[PDB]
DNA sequence: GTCGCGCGCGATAAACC
DNA sequence: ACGGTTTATCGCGCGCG
């Protein structure tokens, strides 16, 4: 269900979702696998939506 | 996606609710099965196939 | 396959309870983590370990269900 | 860190422009494949090496 | 502080045809 | 004087601290 709810990074997505920061880059880089979404170079890299 | 297209079109020709191997794919389509478990495990992880755990594992259409 | 003995030995100690991963085994023994997958994952095939799958997937020892 | 030392050895042994996999830098030099990709991606951020895309991954000397 | 990693994978045993 | 070839969860890309 994680998925569901979902530019920012992992980073901010795991204090303002409470959970925890491999999780989320855990369902970024399936959905972005999936082409929903695009990865922008960072340390951390910037995650954005793909229209 | 042309190599994605071959294979559901393949899983949704072969019947409704049939599912099939990635041996059985690489002969139908004549490809290295190599090139097909690269597609189908793409197609699972991009939730295009349902993957059945076995010896060998079995694909099906996915929701 | 002289560290699937002391893979189950560790695995056999402190039993009762949980389980542990192939990352803290491949510390706790000494061992390249290559070597003690390899080692569990035909472990697991031989009915002496059970695999429970996760990320990292846990190992125990093997539970008859009969 | 002589590990760095052989592989950039290897590759120069190997030919002009020619390239190899890790998993055949690890046979080779008896080295484990854990060892030898950190090296190779560490190689390849100072610049001297340089990475094919693929699978597996394609490393030569870099031409930069 | 990038990191998502689940990986065992053959220096292969076994199975196939 | 002689079983070659393919499978196996074989999909692997992995380097991770």
């Known amino acids: ?3 569901q709810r ?3 990074t992992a980073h901010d ?3 303002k979702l409470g959970t ?3 999780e989320i880059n855990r ?3 399936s959905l972005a696998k999936k082409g929903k ?3 922008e170079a960072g340390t951390p890299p910037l995650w954005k939506i793909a229209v």
């Open 1 to 3: 269900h994680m998925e």
């Open 13 to 15: 997505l795991s204090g």
């Open 20 to 22: 925890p920061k491999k």
């Open 37 to 39: 979404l695009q990865k």
């Open 27 to 29: 369902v970024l880089y």
């Open 6 to 8: 979902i530019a920012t």
